[PDB]
Amino acid sequence: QEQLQQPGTELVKPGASVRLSCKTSGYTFASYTLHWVKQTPGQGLDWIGAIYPGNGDTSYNQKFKDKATLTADKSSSTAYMQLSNLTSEDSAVYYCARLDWYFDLWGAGTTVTVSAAGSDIVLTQSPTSLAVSLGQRATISCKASQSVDYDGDSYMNWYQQKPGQPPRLLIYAASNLESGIPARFSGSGSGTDFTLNIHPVEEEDAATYYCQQNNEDPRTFGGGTKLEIKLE
Ligand SMILES: [Cl-]
Ligand SMILES: [Cl-]
Ligand SMILES: [Cl-]
Ligand SMILES: [Cl-]
Ligand SMILES: [Cl-]
Ligand SMILES: [Cl-]
Ligand code: NA
Ligand code: NA
């Protein structure tokens, strides 16, 4: 099967550099763009940049242009991201992924822990945490600072990350369930306003949910909503 394999942890000093690896298998490495994404508790997910492995071409979010360097090694089907001049603000989890919905694939992420004891579109999620009883409804809003529609399609997806598991696509283009996603999930919305609904909620639905837009560069994500089960 198709896999993106990333090391679990890197424990690193301020001021050093670290190289993160993403070993791919199961498909032709050279033919699909790979993207790197930073996750933190307060800021949700941040798109770092992308590489086309076939030729090594790269694109970077302006905010990461000095911090990250993406490379690819066709001989080992492995992509790498170097993070330079590490600071405490680099502590985070970093994922490699195929982000276009039709090819959705995520690595499990590398935690980078920097340790020393001593006009982008903004997406706002509401609420940012909620507890819902088994059998009841969860409803989560995502609102964009500008329209994410083109030609009557909404270039917005929802992602789910269950505890201990990689993120995965949940709904694409506002209202379409990804293959294998249960019927109790539904998405609505257009323009700047989108809503995820889950009913009836089951235990397996405890997760962090993120919206994402890909109408304009850079791709951006909401800060995440953590759904837990309200024990009765
Ligand atoms: Cl290849
Ligand atoms: Cl660039
Ligand atoms: Cl809120
Ligand atoms: Cl439109
Ligand atoms: Cl269901
Ligand atoms: Cl948010
Ligand atoms: Na390969
Ligand atoms: Na609100």
Side-chain angles (χ1 to χ4, degrees), residues 2-22 24-61 63-64 66-231:
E2 303 179 54
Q3 306 182 63
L4 301 177
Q5 172 181 298
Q6 293 182 259
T9 46
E10 291 292 339
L11 183 73
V12 294
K13 309 180 82 167
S17 301
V18 64
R19 197 168 70 138
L20 297 196
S21 53
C22 171
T24 79
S25 59
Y27 74 96
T28 303
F29 174 63
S31 298
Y32 291 80
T33 297
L34 284 173
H35 297 257
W36 286 86
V37 173
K38 179 180 172 175
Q39 170 178 57
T40 59
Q43 278 170 37
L45 302 181
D46 223 326
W47 181 73
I48 291 170
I51 185 163
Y52 184 66
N55 63 17
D57 282 353
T58 50
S59 294
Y60 290 91
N61 186 333
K63 69 185 289 197
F64 287 100
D66 299 309
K67 173 63 57 173
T69 308
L70 301 193
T71 62
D73 180 5
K74 282 185 298 170
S75 67
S76 66
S77 306
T78 297
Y80 295 96
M81 173 167 72
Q82 182 201 60
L83 299 171
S84 66
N85 300 308
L86 287 166
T87 74
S88 304
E89 290 56 64
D90 301 314
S91 295
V93 181
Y94 293 87
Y95 290 96
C96 66
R98 298 189 314 217
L99 290 179
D100 295 323
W101 64 257
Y102 34 85
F103 304 142
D104 182 70
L105 183 64
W106 294 69
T110 306
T111 295
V112 176
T113 299
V114 177
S115 174
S119 55
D120 292 355
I121 301 183
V122 177
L123 293 185
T124 302
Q125 297 184 212
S126 184
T128 62
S129 64
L130 79 175
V132 170
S133 311
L134 281 182
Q136 295 300 104
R137 182 166 289 276
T139 304
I140 299 173
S141 167
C142 172
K143 289 182 176 172
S145 58
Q146 299 168 235
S147 179
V148 299
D149 289 0
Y150 172 80
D151 190 38
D153 297 316
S154 298
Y155 284 66
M156 114 112 17
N157 304 331
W158 290 96
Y159 290 90
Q160 177 189 54
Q161 186 167 32
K162 297 179 179 177
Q165 298 299 124
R168 71 191 176 146
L169 177 71
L170 189 80
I171 291 178
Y172 63 92
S175 62
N176 302 286
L177 292 197
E178 163 66 326
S179 304
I181 294 312
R184 60 183 182 276
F185 288 89
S186 69
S188 67
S190 63
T192 58
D193 308 319
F194 300 87
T195 302
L196 176 68
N197 266 279
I198 316 173
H199 174 266
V201 165
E202 302 189 6
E203 277 166 57
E204 74 188 50
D205 298 333
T208 293
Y209 293 88
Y210 297 97
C211 54
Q212 180 255 210
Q213 68 83 27
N214 62 298
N215 191 44
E216 284 176 36
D217 292 303
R219 296 168 184 256
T220 55
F221 296 83
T225 298
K226 177 171 175 174
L227 172 64
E228 297 174 273
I229 303 306
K230 184 161 180 283
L231 294 189

